[PDB]
């Protein structure tokens, strides 16, 4: 029961998501190893993901989380990148597919920087790159990110094995560093604690 609502470029909702996409790009200090070399995206399409069951699941959990955290959900709009985007918009996030060796264990990973989530689109460390060219900096193939509604509740701050949130907490927040560049990473351990609200189709742009 997922319906995709194709948003017009003149729509403020489209523009808002587009600006969040572009403004949160950072210069990773890994030469573009994982996600490619770029300053900007070519934004092709933004679709609103409408699924009534997934949404009700999300808000049911958000209530429970809110009650356990002094009537605060600590809800954020965050990026997700992975190879499972098309499954996710249909069936929701699912922590049973999470990877056990993740830095913060077996959860579902989000970012406030679009360009960090772009590093996971093709797998962890960007896997083997795009399917067609095996190129992690591919400028041709179109990528997809989710801009999602995420319930963090009481988030546990963790350094850079773990299966669930620590006792009394509903999420983990990390700030891992790659070369003096530390960026935020948010991790939930329940699929219902995020709703994949917008599907963004895009390319990374070749700089001049």
CB-CB contact of 151 with 69 (8 Å): no
Give yes or no for residue 139 binding ligand 8IR (CB under 6 A): no
Alpha helices in the chain (DSSP H): 12-23, 52-68, 85-91, 114-118
CB-CB contact of 132 with 104 (8 Å): no
Given ligand 8IR, Zn ion, none, residue 84, with its beta carbon under 5 to 8 Å by kind, binds ligand 8IR
Give yes or no for residue 163 binding ligand 8IR (CB under 6 A): no
Residue 122: which of 107, 135, 139 has the closest Cα? 135
Give yes or no for residue 87 binding ligand 8IR (CB under 6 A): yes
Distance CA 56, CA 165 (A): 22
Residues before each break in the chain (C–N > 2.5 Å)? 160
Given Zn ion, ligand 8IR, none, residue 120, with its beta carbon under 5 to 8 Å by kind, binds ligand 8IR
Which of 41, 58, 79, 93: binder of ligand 8IR (CB under 6 A)? 93
Which of 45, 64, 123, 135: binder of ligand 8IR (CB under 6 A)? 123
Distance CA 68, CA 187 (A): 18
50 is annotated as contributing to ligand binding:
no
Minimum Å gap between C-beta 16 and ligand 8IR is: 23
Give yes or no for residue 130 binding Zn ion (CB under 5 A): yes
| 38-46, 57-65, 134-142, 152-160 -> range binding Zn ion (CB under 5 A) | 134-142
Annotated binding site for Zn(2+): 130, 133, 138, 141
């Amino acid at each position: 029961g997922t319906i995709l609502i194709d948003l017009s470029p003149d729509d403020k909702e489209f523009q808002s998501v587009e600006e969040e996409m572009q403004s949160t790009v950072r210069e990773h200090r890994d030469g573009g190893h994982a996600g490619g070399i770029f300053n900007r995206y070519n934004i092709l399409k933004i679709q609103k993901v409408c699924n009534k069951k997934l949404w009700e699941r999300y808000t049911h959990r958000r209530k429970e989380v809110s009650e356990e955290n002094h009537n605060h959900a600590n809800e954020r709009m965050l990026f997700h990148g992975s190879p499972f985007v098309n499954a996710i918009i249909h069936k929701g996030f699912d922590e049973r597919h999470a990877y056990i060796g993740g830095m913060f264990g077996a959860g579902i990973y989000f970012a406030e920087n679009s360009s960090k989530s772009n590093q996971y689109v093709y797998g962890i460390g960007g896997g083997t790159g795009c399917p067609v060219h095996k190129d992690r900096s591919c400028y041709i193939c179109h990528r997809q990110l989710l801009f999602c509604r995420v319930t963090l509740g009481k988030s546990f701050l963790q350094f850079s094995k773990m299966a669930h949130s620590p006792p009394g907490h509903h999420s983990v927040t990390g700030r891992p560093s790659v070369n003096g560049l530390a960026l935020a990473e948010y991790v939930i351990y329940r699929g219902e604690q995020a709703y994949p609200e917008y599907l963004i189709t895009y390319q990374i742009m070749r700089p001049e």
